[PDB]
Structure formats: C-alpha cells, structure tokens
Write a protein that holds these residues in place. Structure first.
Motif, mmCIF file in Angstrom:
data_model
loop_
_atom_site.group_PDB
_atom_site.id
_atom_site.type_symbol
_atom_site.label_atom_id
_atom_site.label_comp_id
_atom_site.label_asym_id
_atom_site.label_seq_id
_atom_site.Cartn_x
_atom_site.Cartn_y
_atom_site.Cartn_z
ATOM 1 N N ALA B 167 0.830 -1.206 0.000
ATOM 2 C CA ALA B 167 0.000 0.000 0.000
ATOM 3 C C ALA B 167 0.861 1.250 0.000
ATOM 4 O O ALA B 167 1.167 1.811 1.061
ATOM 5 N N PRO B 168 1.276 1.723 -1.176
ATOM 6 C CA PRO B 168 2.132 2.918 -1.197
ATOM 7 C C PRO B 168 1.377 4.203 -0.893
ATOM 8 O O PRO B 168 1.957 5.113 -0.290
ATOM 9 N N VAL B 169 0.111 4.316 -1.290
ATOM 10 C CA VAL B 169 -0.692 5.510 -1.035
ATOM 11 C C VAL B 169 -2.015 5.102 -0.401
ATOM 12 O O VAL B 169 -2.815 4.393 -1.026
ATOM 13 N N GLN B 170 -2.243 5.546 0.831
ATOM 14 C CA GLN B 170 -3.491 5.325 1.544
ATOM 15 C C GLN B 170 -4.080 6.662 1.972
ATOM 16 O O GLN B 170 -3.359 7.643 2.168
ATOM 17 N N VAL B 171 -5.405 6.692 2.112
ATOM 18 C CA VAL B 171 -6.135 7.885 2.525
ATOM 19 C C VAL B 171 -6.932 7.550 3.777
ATOM 20 O O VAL B 171 -7.525 6.471 3.877
ATOM 21 N N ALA B 172 -6.931 8.475 4.736
ATOM 22 C CA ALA B 172 -7.706 8.298 5.955
ATOM 23 C C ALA B 172 -9.197 8.233 5.643
ATOM 24 O O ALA B 172 -9.678 8.812 4.664
ATOM 25 N N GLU B 173 -9.930 7.517 6.490
ATOM 26 C CA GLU B 173 -11.367 7.380 6.320
ATOM 27 C C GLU B 173 -12.086 8.654 6.745
ATOM 28 O O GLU B 173 -11.669 9.352 7.674
ATOM 29 N N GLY B 174 -13.180 8.950 6.052
ATOM 30 C CA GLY B 174 -14.089 9.996 6.474
ATOM 31 C C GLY B 174 -13.745 11.389 6.005
ATOM 32 O O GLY B 174 -14.263 12.358 6.570
ATOM 33 N N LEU B 175 -12.891 11.527 4.993
ATOM 34 C CA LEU B 175 -12.576 12.841 4.448
ATOM 35 C C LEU B 175 -13.680 13.280 3.496
ATOM 36 O O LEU B 175 -14.139 12.495 2.660
ATOM 37 N N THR B 176 -14.103 14.533 3.622
ATOM 38 C CA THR B 176 -15.091 15.122 2.734
ATOM 39 C C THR B 176 -14.526 16.369 2.066
ATOM 40 O O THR B 176 -13.606 17.014 2.578
ATOM 41 N N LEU B 177 -15.092 16.700 0.907
ATOM 42 C CA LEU B 177 -14.748 17.917 0.194
ATOM 43 C C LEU B 177 -16.018 18.711 -0.077
ATOM 44 O O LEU B 177 -17.075 18.119 -0.334
ATOM 45 N N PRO B 178 -15.955 20.044 -0.018
ATOM 46 C CA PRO B 178 -17.172 20.832 -0.272
ATOM 47 C C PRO B 178 -17.648 20.764 -1.711
ATOM 48 O O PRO B 178 -18.861 20.802 -1.950
ATOM 49 N N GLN B 179 -16.738 20.660 -2.678
ATOM 50 C CA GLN B 179 -17.098 20.704 -4.089
ATOM 51 C C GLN B 179 -16.878 19.391 -4.824
ATOM 52 O O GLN B 179 -17.671 19.045 -5.702
ATOM 53 N N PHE B 180 -15.828 18.652 -4.493
ATOM 54 C CA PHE B 180 -15.408 17.491 -5.262
ATOM 55 C C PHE B 180 -15.693 16.201 -4.498
ATOM 56 O O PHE B 180 -16.248 16.201 -3.397
ATOM 57 N N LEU B 181 -15.298 15.089 -5.115
ATOM 58 C CA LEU B 181 -15.468 13.759 -4.536
ATOM 59 C C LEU B 181 -14.260 12.947 -4.979
ATOM 60 O O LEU B 181 -14.115 12.654 -6.169
ATOM 61 N N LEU B 182 -13.400 12.585 -4.030
ATOM 62 C CA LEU B 182 -12.155 11.899 -4.355
ATOM 63 C C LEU B 182 -12.435 10.427 -4.627
ATOM 64 O O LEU B 182 -12.983 9.725 -3.771
ATOM 65 N N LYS B 183 -12.065 9.963 -5.818
ATOM 66 C CA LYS B 183 -12.311 8.579 -6.187
ATOM 67 C C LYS B 183 -11.360 7.646 -5.444
ATOM 68 O O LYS B 183 -10.345 8.064 -4.878
ATOM 69 N N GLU B 184 -11.703 6.358 -5.452
ATOM 70 C CA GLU B 184 -10.953 5.375 -4.681
ATOM 71 C C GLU B 184 -9.727 4.859 -5.424
ATOM 72 O O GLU B 184 -8.790 4.371 -4.782
ATOM 73 N N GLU B 185 -9.708 4.961 -6.750
ATOM 74 C CA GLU B 185 -8.663 4.367 -7.573
ATOM 75 C C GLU B 185 -7.583 5.399 -7.869
ATOM 76 O O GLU B 185 -7.886 6.531 -8.261
ATOM 77 N N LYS B 186 -6.324 5.002 -7.679
ATOM 78 C CA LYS B 186 -5.176 5.881 -7.846
ATOM 79 C C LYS B 186 -4.142 5.222 -8.746
ATOM 80 O O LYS B 186 -3.894 4.018 -8.644
ATOM 81 N N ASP B 187 -3.542 6.018 -9.625
ATOM 82 C CA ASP B 187 -2.486 5.544 -10.506
ATOM 83 C C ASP B 187 -1.130 5.731 -9.839
ATOM 84 O O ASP B 187 -0.867 6.766 -9.222
ATOM 85 N N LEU B 188 -0.272 4.722 -9.967
ATOM 86 C CA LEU B 188 1.130 4.839 -9.591
ATOM 87 C C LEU B 188 1.957 4.769 -10.866
ATOM 88 O O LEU B 188 1.947 3.745 -11.558
ATOM 89 N N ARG B 189 2.672 5.848 -11.172
ATOM 90 C CA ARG B 189 3.405 5.954 -12.423
ATOM 91 C C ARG B 189 4.867 6.271 -12.151
ATOM 92 O O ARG B 189 5.235 6.742 -11.072
ATOM 93 N N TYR B 190 5.700 6.010 -13.152
ATOM 94 C CA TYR B 190 7.027 6.597 -13.237
ATOM 95 C C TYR B 190 6.959 7.839 -14.114
ATOM 96 O O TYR B 190 6.338 7.822 -15.181
ATOM 97 N N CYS B 191 7.598 8.917 -13.665
ATOM 98 C CA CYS B 191 7.713 10.137 -14.458
ATOM 99 C C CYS B 191 9.181 10.555 -14.516
ATOM 100 O O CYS B 191 9.556 11.667 -14.149
ATOM 101 N N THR B 192 10.019 9.629 -14.982
ATOM 102 C CA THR B 192 11.464 9.801 -14.918
ATOM 103 C C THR B 192 11.905 11.002 -15.746
ATOM 104 O O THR B 192 11.534 11.136 -16.915
ATOM 105 N N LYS B 193 12.700 11.877 -15.135
ATOM 106 C CA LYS B 193 13.158 13.090 -15.796
ATOM 107 C C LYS B 193 14.448 12.821 -16.559
ATOM 108 O O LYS B 193 15.363 12.168 -16.049
ATOM 109 N N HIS B 194 14.513 13.332 -17.786
ATOM 110 C CA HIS B 194 15.722 13.297 -18.601
ATOM 111 C C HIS B 194 16.187 14.734 -18.798
ATOM 112 O O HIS B 194 15.517 15.519 -19.475
ATOM 113 N N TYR B 195 17.330 15.074 -18.213
ATOM 114 C CA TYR B 195 17.909 16.405 -18.336
ATOM 115 C C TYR B 195 19.256 16.321 -19.048
ATOM 116 O O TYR B 195 19.697 15.251 -19.474
#
Ligand SMILES: *[C@@H]1O[C@H](CO)[C@@H](O[C@@H]2O[C@H](CO)[C@@H](O)[C@H](O)[C@H]2NC(C)=O)[C@H](O)[C@H]1NC(C)=O
Ligand SMILES: *[C@@H]1O[C@H](CO)[C@@H](O[C@@H]2O[C@H](CO)[C@@H](O)[C@H](O)[C@H]2NC(C)=O)[C@H](O)[C@H]1NC(C)=O
Ligand SMILES: *[C@@H]1O[C@H](CO)[C@@H](O[C@@H]2O[C@H](CO)[C@@H](O)[C@H](O)[C@H]2NC(C)=O)[C@H](O)[C@H]1NC(C)=O
Ligand SMILES: *[C@@H]1O[C@H](CO)[C@@H](O[C@@H]2O[C@H](CO)[C@@H](O)[C@H](O)[C@H]2NC(C)=O)[C@H](O)[C@H]1NC(C)=O
Ligand SMILES: *[C@@H]1O[C@H](CO)[C@@H](O[C@@H]2O[C@H](CO)[C@@H](O)[C@H](O)[C@H]2NC(C)=O)[C@H](O)[C@H]1NC(C)=O
Lengths: 346, 346, 346, 346, 346
Positions: B167-195
C-alpha cells in the motif's frame, strides 16, 4: 544550594541522566495524564473543513531518575530554555493542520519537578484542527468537532495517555460563536490506533455544535412564505383583468428569483443539495404553478356559458387546493428535518 | 550500553561515518521505497490552481555502514535532533508551491535503524501542490491532481525511488470535500526526468476528482428551465392583450437576467466559456425570441381578415415550435456534455 | 581520500580560501551565466499589481582558487550546509516583493565544483514579483510582466551577469492561467543600472500575457446587445398602447441596470474608465433614448391629423435610425479597441 | 593584507572596538543622514488603515574608531554576516505595523567604511505602515500617508537624524495604483518627540494621494442622473393613463434601488456618511417625489372642470420645478465638494 | 571602565548573578509596574471575534542584585542581545491569539538599570486579542474589548502586577476606525486568577467602542421607510384601476426585496436575529399587508351599492390606520433600542 545548581546536579553529566531514554526504560510503560483548558474557540470554516483553538495543555508523569530528598523545597522549576535536558512525551495532535507555540514576553511553557519524581508540564499553543462537516441539513445541522492526542513513536507498552479524572477538558466562560453554539457536554473516548508497527495510544474529545436558526427564519424562510402567499391572491382577482393577474404572477416569480439570488452570497459554497435549497426550489415551483393556473383559466375562458363556469371552477378549486398542498409540504418538511434527522446518538 | 552511547559509537568519529556520502558510494544505486498516508485533503482552489494536503511520508533504504550485531536490541532509534548525523535521500516534491514540517510538541519525525542496516524514516509534513484545472465542462468537469516525488541532485545511477508494493498511497477514512469527490482508484506511475545532467528518478500518484452536480441542478439549471417555460405561456394568451404579453415577455427577460447575475457570485472566475455559460446564453436567447415573436404577431395583426389569421398562425406554430427546438437543444447539450466528453481514459 | 576531506583541503584554513573575496580579486570582473526554469506561474493580481512564480535559478562562474588536479573525480559536490564556505554572487531580484527558499526534506540547493574551477550553483525559490498593469482596454488588454536579476553590491568592473545562449528561460509544459494566456516568445534584455556609485549589472526577461475574451463576450457584451435590440421593438408597437410601450421601455432600462450591477462583482476594482465601462454606458444611453423617443411620440400625438402623422413619422424614422447609429458605434468601438491599440511593438 | 584580515585588525579585540558604544561616546551627538528609495508602493487598504511599501534605506554617519590610513584602498566592505561587530543606529519606523528584511540569494544589506571613518549602510526592507484615512468626501477624497523614522533609545544629545539635501526621498518610475494617484511633491518635516525621558529625534515624509473619479462618474453618478431624468417623463404623459404613470414611477424607484444596491459591493465599508451616499439619497428622494406628484394629480383629478385644470396645473408646474430644483442641488453638491473642501494646505 | 565591561562585572560569573532566580528570592514578592502606549488599534473582526493592537509595553521593578555605587553614571543600558542574562517577569497576555516582537533595524527593546537597582524594560509588540461580541442590537451596539496582563508561572507571593498611577494606558492621537469610535474613558481593573496552584496576579484594561449609525440611517432605514410610504399611495388611487394598484403593490414588494437582498452583502454574518433584521422584517410585513388590503377591496367591490361603500370604507380606514400603526411601531422600535438597552453600567 541555589535551586538551579541543584538542577544541574540532578540532571548532571555526573548523574548520567539521558533525555533520550524514557523513564522505566526496561519496565512498565509511562502513564501520562492530560488536561485541556480551552481559552478560545472559533474560526469554524466550511471551505477548509477546520476550526481554530487556543489551549493550555498539561501533561503529568513520573520520572524516578528525578527523585530527590536532600533539597528542602518540595518542588523545583526547570527553565524553559533548558527543556531539552529532560525527557518529555512525544504528544502530537493527529488531526492537526497547523500549530505553533507562544513566545510573547517569556516562552509560554512551565515544568515542575516534585520530590517523588513527578513532572508537571504545561504549555500554551494554538491549533488548527480538521473537522469534516456534512451540511445536508444546513440551516438545521449539528456538527461534531474532535481533538485527538496521540504519541508519535511509542507503542502502548512504552507510553500510555489518559484523561484526568476530575476535569480533563474545561472551557473558559463567555465564549461566543457567530454561527454555532458549543454545547456543555463533551465525550472522552479512547481512539487507540492499531498499525503494522504495533498499538499506539490515542485519546480524543468530541465537541457538539448546534447552528442557530433565528436569522435564517427571519430572513429566508418567512419572506419566501410571504411571497408564496402573495402568489395566491391572483385567485381572488377577477379573471377578466389579465394584465393584473399576469403581471402579479410574473412579478411574484421575479421576486422569488431576487430572493434566491440575494440569499446566494451568505450561504456555504458546497456542491450538493441542502435543505434550504429544497425549500427554495419548492417555493419557486409554487409560484410557477400559480401562473400556469391563470394561463389555463385565461385560455379556457375564451372559446367563442359552459366555458365561463369551468374556468371559474378552476379558480375556486385553486383557492383551497394551493394553500392545502403548501400546508402538507410544510408539515413534511419540518417533520423530516426536525424529528426524523437527529445525529447526536453518539 | 545505553542505546544512545551505542549510536554515538556506530555513527562515531572513530567509526568514520560521513553523512555526506551515500551508502554504496562506489557501487550500485540506493533503492528507496516510499509510502504516503494522506491525513487531510482539501483547499482545492481554481484561482491559484493548487490544492493542500497533509501527509505522512515514509522512506526505507539500506545503509551497510549502520549494520551492527553486538547490541541485543534488533532496532535502534535516532533522536530527531541528531538527524543531520546520518545520510538521507534528498527527496523533493516537484510540483510543490509550499511546504513545512510539524514541530508541535516534539518534532514530528522518526528514524529507526535495524540490525542489517535498514533505515526507516517517517516524517509528517503539509504541502501545497500545484494542479492545472480545465473548467471547460465546469458543472460537469473531472480533474486530476498529481504528486511527484523526485531526487534533487542524484542521477538514477546513485538513487532510485520506488513505490511500496502493498500500500504505497493510503487515505484516511471519512474525508469530505465541499465541491469534489475523491475517487478510490489511484495511478502509480514513473515520471522519470531526462535532463542535460542525466537521468533523475521520479515517481508520481494521480488522484481523480469528480464535481457533484446536485446543487447546480436544483439552483441554476432547473430555475432557468422554469423561466423558459414561463416565456411560452404568452403563446396561449389572447393576442389583443398587448400590455399582458409585452409585460410578461420583458419581465421574463428581466427574471432571466437576475437569475444569471445572481448566479455570478458563486462561479469560478475564469476568462473562457464554460458549459453553464452556454446553457445560460441559450436560455436567454429563448426568452429573447419569445418576445420577438409577439412583436411580429402584434405588428402583422394591425394592417388596417387575411391578416388576423396569419397572425394567429404564428401563435399556433410557435406553440409547438418553441418547446420542440428547446427539447432538441436539451438533447444535444446533455449528450455532448455527459457522453461525448470523458477524460479519464488515463 | 573521501570526497569531503578533499573539500576540506581545497577550501581549507591551510589553503587560505576566503569566501568574502571574489574570484580574480584584482583583475577582470567575474562573468556569471544565468538560467531560469519556470515551474509554476500564476496568482496575477490587479489589487496588488504583482504575480507569483516558482523557478529554478542556475548560476555558473569560474573560481581559479577551486581548481584541482590530484583528485580523480572530475566533479565535486558541496554540501548545502557548507554553502557559506564558498564565494557566491549577490544576485537579487530588483522587482521582488517577497521571496523564500525551499527546505522541504533536504534544502533545495546544489553546488558543483569542476576540475578547472567552474562552479555550478542551482537553487529553487518562490518569488512574488511586481508588475504595473494598465487595464484601460480591460476586456481586450495585453500585459507585460518582467523579472530583473541584479547584483546588490558589485559594480560592472567586478561582476557581470549574462543570459545563457542556448536556453536561458524555459517554462514547464502544461501550465494554465484562469484569466491570461502566456505567450511563447520572451525578450532577453539588458537593463544596466547607472547610479552615483557606478555601473551595476542587470538582466531581465519580459513575458507577454493576453486576456481571453470568450467569457466576457458570452456573458456581458452579447446580453447587453440583446437588451438594446429588445428596446427597439417599441417602435413596431402601436403608439396608442402606452402602458405597453412605457412598461417595455422602463423594464428595458431596469434590465440594463441589473445587467450592469450584476456584472459589477466580477470586474477589476480600478478608479479609471475601462472599455467595458464605455460599452455599458453607451448601451444604457441607447435604452434611455428609446424611452425618450416614446415620450416625444406620446406627447406630440395628443394635441386636441397633422399631429398624428408627425408622430407616426417619428416612429418610422426611429425604426431605421436607432439600429444604424448602433451599428456605427459598434464599428468604431471594435475598430479602435482591436486595431488602433496594439502595445506589443516592444 | 587581505581586505578581510584588515577588518579583523580594525574592529579587533586588540583594537578594543565595542559595538555597543556609540561614536563620540562622551562628546557631541552622532549625525545620521538618511535616504529613501521607494521601489514599490501600493496595497492601500481602508479596512486596516494601512499601506505597503518596499524601500531602500541608506544611512550615513562617521565613526572615528574606524579611520585607517595604512591600507591603500580608500573603501572597505563589511560582510553582511559580520554586521553585529559594528555600531549602528537604532532606527525604527514609528508608524510601522509590520516589517521584514530580504534574504533571497545573499542578505540584501551593504556596509562600506571609508578612510576617514565614514560609514555607508544600505538595506532593503518591506514595510506595512499605518495611515488614518477620512473618506467623508469619498469619490473626491485626498489622502496623506506619512513615514516616520525615529531612534528607539537615544535622545537628541546622542543621536540626530537628518534628511539628505540632494534627494532624500525618490520613487521609481512607472509605478501605478488601482485607485489613487501619487503626487510628485513630498514634504520633509521634523516630528521631534518630547517624552518624559527626553527629546528624541524623528524625521518624516508625507505623500499625497488623489483618487481618480472617472469610473465613479461613468458608473454611479451618470446612471443615477439618467434615472432621475427618466422619472420626469411622467409629467409629459397624459394624466388619464394611470397604469402607465404609476408603473413608470414605481419601476423608476426600483431601478434606483437596484442601482444603489448593486453599487454597494464596490464601495469602502465605513459607518459614517460619504458624499456618494448623499448623492444616492437625494436621487432616491427625487424619484420618490415624482411618484407622489402623480398620486396627488390622480387624486385631485377625480372629485365627481375646476378640478381638471388644477390637476393639469400641477403637471405643468412640476415640468419646470423638478429639473430646476435638481439643477440647484447639482450646483450646491459639486461646489461644496470640489471648491469648499480642499485639505492640502499642509 | 567602559559601560559594558562594568555590566560584565555586575552580572558576572564572579558576581554569581543567576537570571533564573527572582529578586528577593526568599522574601516579599516582586512588584512590577506596567504601562501601555497604544500606537495603533483596528482590524476589529466579527468573524474571528478579535481585534489587533500595536503597543509599547513598559515594566518597572527593583533588583537589589543590580545595585551599584562605584560607577559615576546613574544609569546603565543593557544590550538587547544580552537580555537573557537578566531576570525578567514572565508576563503574558491571557486573551492573546497571536503576538510577535519587532526586529526591523535593531530589535525594538530597551532595558535600563539604575543606581539603586531599579530596572526599566520597554518593548514594542503586535497583538491579536480576542473579544466576544454580541451584535443583538447591531446597527446600535456597544462593544467592550479587554486586555489582560498575567504572570505565567508565579503566584501572588512571588510576583505582583500593578498599573502605573499617572498614566498606565495612553492612546496615540489621530487614530480612526472604519466602523467604531473608541471612547476616551478606560477602566483599570484587577482580574486576579484563583487556580488549584494558587493565586496568580492579573490586571486588565477595558476599551469601549460605539458603532456609528449615520451610514445605516442614510442607506438602510430611510430607503425602507420611503418604500413603506410608497406602498400607502395605493389607498388614494381609484379602486377600479386594478392593474395600477396590483402592479404598484407587487413592485413595492419587489423593491423591498431587492433592498433587503442588496443590503445582505455589507452586514455581519451571524446566525441570530439583529435589530436591523427586525426592522427589515416589519417593513416587509407592511408592504405585504398593503397588497392584501387591495385584494380584499377588489374582491368585496364585485359581488354582482352596499358593496361599493363597504369597499370604499376599507380604503378610507386604511388611509389612517396604516400610517398610525407604523408610527406606533417606530416609537416602540427606537425606544426599546435607544433607551431600554444600555450596557455600559460597567
Ligand atoms: C501504568 O499504568 C498501568 C496500568 O494501570 C500499569 O500496569 C499495571 O501495573 C500493575 C503493577 O502493580 C500490574 O499489577 C498490572 O497487571 C499492570 N496492568 C497492565 C495492563 O499492564 C503500569 O505499571 C503503570 N506504569 C508505571 C510506570 O507505574
Ligand atoms: C537497487 O535495485 C537495482 C534494481 O533492482 C539493483 O540493480 C541490479 O542489481 C543486480 C545485482 O544482483 C544485478 O544483477 C542487476 O543487473 C541490476 N540491475 C540494474 C538495472 O542495474 C541494485 O543492485 C540495487 N541496489 C542495491 C544497493 O542493492
Ligand atoms: C569576463 O568577460 C569579459 C568580456 O567578455 C572579459 O573582458 C575581456 O577580456 C579580454 C581578455 O582576453 C580582453 O581582451 C577584452 O578587452 C575584455 N573586454 C572588456 C569589455 O573588458 C573578462 O576578461 C572576463 N572575465 C574573466 C575573469 O575571464
Ligand atoms: C552633529 O551636528 C551638530 C549640529 O550641526 C553639531 O553640533 C554643533 O557642533 C559645532 C562644532 O563646531 C558647534 O559649534 C555647535 O554649537 C553645535 N551645535 C549644536 C546645536 O550643538 C555636532 O558637533 C555634530 N556631531 C559631530 C560628531 O560632528
Ligand atoms: C511589594 O508590595 C507589597 C505591597 O505593597 C509589599 O508588601 C508589604 O510590605 C510591607 C513592608 O514594609 C509590609 O509592612 C506589608 O504588610 C506588606 N503587605 C503585604 C500585603 O504583604 C512588599 O514588601 C513589596 N515587595 C518589595 C520587594 O518591596
């Protein structure tokens, strides 16, 4: 001896006191007793889902490495600049979004070591604590704000928090809130955390807030009801005066619209439906339907004697039917929002 | 030995530990495993294109210079005031606009050294992270907020970040937002930088937010539709009552205008066209056209029998034509905004 | 040798390196090459005349006191906690109103010393930079925000700043603004300061921002134009229906007024006249004049056959004259605001 | 010698320089010459009665303990990290509500010691300075913001501040304000404090700000005047058309009310009467009186030939009397607010 | 001797001065005399129930360990960087929500030691102090803000605070407030705290603030009264003109509604009923009742000579009854809000 040089002997290098080792390091856990005194309470914000508090936090525990009998005074006082020379619990507020200590004049801290080794540690601090709010029954909503005290890095076989038995949470007299009303009764609970690392101690307090309704009654509900009543006087106006009944119907709809749009700057900005939104929508459907009734009376009345009395019958039925269905709606609205929805069973 | 004096021997001057040299300094890169626990989530702001988060960040890596076997305890704990005596990864949040640590009570930090040299490092911090938002389909928009963890000064042959497998990313239970609704599914990606300097490690997480529509339905879309329906009842009023049909037409335009201008304080301040603006403009064009229809009926009807029936035909055609074209507009509006525009293919 | 102990030999007390003395202390000035990478860009505010940016700043110069050949590695890395042991340029942002560095996790700084003595110094920082804005052509205005990099205490015979030749200023992909649109082309200029003390180096960059007009078109300009068109339908209504033409005229004036007053919460608060204010004033003068025309028709028509046709002639002239003069005004308005006013000659 | 080691000899322990003792400790007072360069100026706020500034402050004085002749260079430069090794005046801003220094890149400070012992000390800092504002003549008000430089703990027989003679206060070119206009002429005054402790030095500068009126003219004064003119066209409408004259009178009152209430979001929130409030109240009394005139005409006209002509005489008198008394009010309003009230006699 | 080396002898290690021990450590308590000079006063906020102040705080006490006779100067001055070398009282502000010191230029602090051992200690600091506000009589409310000075950790047998006798609290000349008016008379009280630990010293000052009413009179009360008067002119209009009396009645209700909703952005956001809300509700009930009166006149008048005169009698009774009951309401409103409610008995 000066009370300070005695402290430098008690927590001395020759004494071998280590501030990074808990009391009773091999044996039973440390028992910390906690008090809260709330100086101020406010800034309750729905946009950020948090509230602001200013408290005195008092912690009491026993350190047998600090017991002394040779000194005559039965209490010593550590300087607030020497506080890193003594072990202290790693208490943190689990739902804190921001915090700071107070350093106006001298640091607002205090540590007292007794003869038997008991430590009393009292600090003053400002918190911003998160609280999720619901707002589905908004004019008539009840909220619950909590406050959780947790150890950061000690399991429950090293460190245990407990509330005081006499008065663990007190509130200063004379605090007011612009929107809410803080109730007198507070819950003291355990909210013990179970993680992969182990069992971590955590105590909490719950505050109950009830929103006052008097302003919303005198400024939103009652003017909307007067506008709905004003839309019913078309049914007693003669059906031949079409400019009178049409202009009264559409100006009643416009008044309903300026009432809603003017009330739109002083309400909480959420994205779901509130109870005041239900009320404002039904009052708009009522003034919309009173104008459709005249559109039917005016159309049925001109089809050229049987047609004149059918149109007069629509008026005489609407004279009793519109106030009755509005009384039924008022009964179901106030019953389901003031009886069928109580959330303080706790 | 006291657990501290053993630390002072492990990271000692006689040991020659250097906190400015990475583990395995000549060999393979350091592999850091990362977890995120989200305590709070909110303050999503279109004016600044950012959101606020409060997280626990946990990093795990291996340091062979910290392996020990002589001590009986299988875990040691570094003091948070001695954290600059040990090497730590230089993790930074690439899209951060502001950050701070938490020092209420004791510093909210934790470092644990194991027997084999594994280090567990857990800190609590508050972030303000940037997120570009679109808002073209505003009442019905879906947003994506990201969170990128990058090394500041180490290429991918010295330092590599990875998410935890369980479980790399977990969210506490019972969080609410006034305008939005946070979905349960989350993407874990690589965004490797090439400089120009080389290849830099970077991992990210994507959160999906859906705006709730119920309030905008009950307060903006439905009242506008009732005002449009009210503009159609002119077609059933007798064409001789010009003060009635003209006053109903212009008061319907004024009601449409107070509805738009009152809705103008609770919408996001952007400079491009939103879907609610399209809806509000078409409803205004509909109530504008119903008043132009009566201006044509009133002008054609007075040209002095052929002229009376041409004007009555305009009314009978408008009785079917205005609701039909408004139903066609509603079908194309809700189809192109709820079927032809989904942006979560990710 | 450990890479650190070599640094302690290079900038050592035995070496006699002094961080308060510039390189080439007696000879030619130091040449610093600068890059900017813009991570975020926004918070453009007319109330404070400033904007907020988050950048990577990279400086490169040569220090011959730091050249080394005995060590095999062709690059060394200074610890961010030892940065006061080395000379650095005293770069400051001349139009800065506020700034801070980033210390989340490890300090967001980086210094690399090469074999020949070249130093690369890269930091991350947040700026609030001032920008005077004009707003005279507000819906259709173009702004220019600058960013000036200056030395605080060195004249141009000790320290010289230059932009990189390949890419001195880059912007991250995917940045959006709620109101503006950042153009792709940027100016690199010298803005060398001449004071009493001497000649001080200073380089700047100019960003060009164009406001989007689509929302102001669909919400302000087009509804005002529909209200003006609605005021012209009085000229096709029979001149005997005085309650119809008077009520349409004054309700059109009231609709024009609620349109202006409702647009009054989403505009910038300045004290001079904007182009939208010119448009809103001319549309109000048009609906005011259409009601004065009926006041003249109604007064001339009752003076008791010559008087009936003079009043009908005023109506037939106003039917062509009001749309023509409004087309002429639209032509001069959009021509002088979209052709005769371009301020990007730079 | 390196320029630094010479500083360590000049302010050395062997030299016995004491940074806590003023120059000429027993003799005449220290004379400090002050300059101000204003980089930015804005954030003028009536809610907090303050404004924000960003300045360069330069102080010059003579220290005979710092005179040197052996070194060839005729100027030395102290490092900003060694600034507590030298005596500096204890200048503070007497009307400051908040201040900070700038540490972006290197600290924005500079100290230069000359051969004869003259010290030049230049720092950059941001101020929030208080200014009481009046607002009684609000659209047409002139404000005066001051800036006082005072010594905290030295009487005028130890420390004296003076402005420079050539240019003590300069402002950068191209500064704009959203509401005000900063005049070019500035007063340099002494504001010497007399306390119980003694006589304390204090110099000040006064800035003059004039509010621009063009937006308030085009958006508030002129639309109200057009609404007042529209209320006069009832007097030219036939007295038998009661729905026309009553609806025009009350819709003119409603337009006056939406004009006032819509202007109510962009005005300063004070509790006393402003000149725009006087104007808005008199225009409301004018449209209220035009409707009372028709109520008198309509009542007098129906008392059943002598009564018809008395009612027509009220209309013909009101046709000349209402514009005349409104011209007299406009003459007394603009004369007493643009001639009889000038407060820049200074 | 240099005045500093004498300080290093007075508070020397050879002297054995301990800054952690109070003066007269075994004997009578320390008596601290306090002054306040208020530089600025404002930011009075009902949302947070607090106000902001900027003060000079002066404390005076006697320390017999600091008496000296060998030095000729009758006053010494401690450096603000050496302030932790001397004992100081632990004064804190009991109702403070936030505070900071001022460090612009040199730290804004001052300590003076006299020959007999008297210490004068003067600091400058900014406070945010809490004040509960009532707002039940809002346009006409009087508030009381306090300011409490308390010792944090000393009981009243060690430390006692007293106000100065001559001028303990002074306010700078020329301070203005946007909403309130600070009275000249101030209370000096004891607010001694009794805790479990013992008796703790505490002194306070009370400030009295009166809200100005002129703007609310000219913008809210008088326009509502003119709208109520305009609703009475229906009673003088002929009862046969139903479009005139119905349109005047409903447009008067709409004007009352736009007056209330436009006044809704500049009032304090509380949840209980204010006096202006009572006034605005009664004026709405008056314009609602004038339209119900015509609905009764219009219905009674058409029942087909006895019916014509009963309807005319309702009009002639309403002509005297509506202004009389409104005068009675005005008498009870202004009497109970300007005579029967004074809360400055203190
Ligand atoms: C802290 O409190 C706990 C619980 O009161 C103590 O644990 C108990 O100790 C007694 C010793 O007489 C035992 O008989 C009990 O079985 C213990 N209970 C549990 C649940 O462990 C603990 O000793 C206290 N710590 C200290 C330092 O006194
Ligand atoms: C960090 O992880 C990487 C990838 O898992 C390791 O690199 C591999 O090391 C093994 C050693 O048995 C080699 O066989 C692979 O070829 C390596 N792969 C790559 C892509 O380099 C690396 O050794 C790990 N670092 C440490 C210190 O254990
Ligand atoms: C910094 O750059 C400047 C300009 O490129 C250098 O100044 C030049 O130095 C060359 C040396 O070969 C001279 O021939 C030129 O006449 C100089 N030009 C000017 C305008 O002074 C300077 O030497 C560089 N500094 C360093 C340390 O290399
Ligand atoms: C600071 O300036 C004051 C005023 O210019 C100097 O005081 C004067 O000193 C001269 C010495 O030649 C006397 O003749 C005057 O009588 C003094 N005037 C007053 C009002 O005292 C003072 O000497 C200057 N300080 C220093 C250190 O030069
Ligand atoms: C501080 O003030 C208190 C009260 O004025 C002093 O206490 C009094 O001391 C006198 C000594 O002459 C006694 O006669 C009184 O009985 C005391 N009164 C009380 C109430 O205790 C105290 O001495 C002062 N402290 C110092 C250090 O002078």
């Amino acid at each position: 001896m000066s009370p300070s040089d005695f402290l430098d002997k008690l927590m001395g290098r020759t004494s071998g006191y280590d501030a990074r080792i808990r009391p009773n390091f091999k044996g039973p856990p440390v028992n910390v007793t906690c008090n809260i005194f709330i100086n101020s309470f406010g800034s309750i914000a729905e946009t950020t889902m948090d509230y602001r508090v200013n408290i005195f936090l008092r912690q009491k525990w026993n350190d047998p490495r600090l017991a002394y009998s040779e000194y005559p005074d039965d209490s010593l006082d550590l300087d607030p600049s020497m506080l890193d020379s003594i072990w202290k619990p790693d208490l943190f507020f689990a739902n804190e979004k921001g915090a700071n200590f107070h350093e106006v004049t001298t640091d607002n801290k205090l540590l007292r070591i007794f003869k038997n080794g008991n430590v009393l540690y009292s600090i003053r601090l400002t918190l911003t604590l998160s609280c999720p709010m619901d707002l589905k029954n908004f004019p008539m909503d009840v909220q619950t704000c909590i406050m959780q005290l947790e150890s950061f890095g000690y399991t429950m076989n090293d460190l245990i928090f407990e509330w005081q038995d006499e008065a663990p949470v007190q509130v200063a007299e004379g605090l007011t809130l612009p929107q809410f009303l803080l109730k007198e009764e507070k819950d003291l609970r355990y909210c013990t955390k179970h993680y992969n690392t182990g069992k971590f101690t955590c105590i909490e307090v719950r505050f109950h807030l009830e929103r006052q309704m008097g302003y919303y009654l005198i400024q939103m509900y009652i003017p909307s009801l007067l506008i709905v009543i004003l839309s019913w006087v078309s049914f007693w106006i003669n059906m031949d005066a079409a400019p009178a009944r049409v202009a009264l119907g559409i100006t009643t709809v416009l008044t309903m619209t300026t009432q809603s749009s003017g009330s739109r700057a002083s309400l909480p900005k959420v994205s779901y439906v509130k109870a005041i939104d239900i009320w404002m929508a039904v009052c708009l459907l009522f003034v919309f339907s009173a104008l459709l009734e005249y559109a039917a009376v005016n159309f049925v009345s001109r089809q050229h004697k049987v047609f004149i009395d059918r149109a007069k019958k629509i008026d005489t039925i609407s004279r009793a039917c519109f106030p009755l269905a509005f009384l039924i709606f008022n009964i179901f609205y106030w019953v389901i929002y003031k009886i069928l929805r109580h959330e303080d069973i706790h």
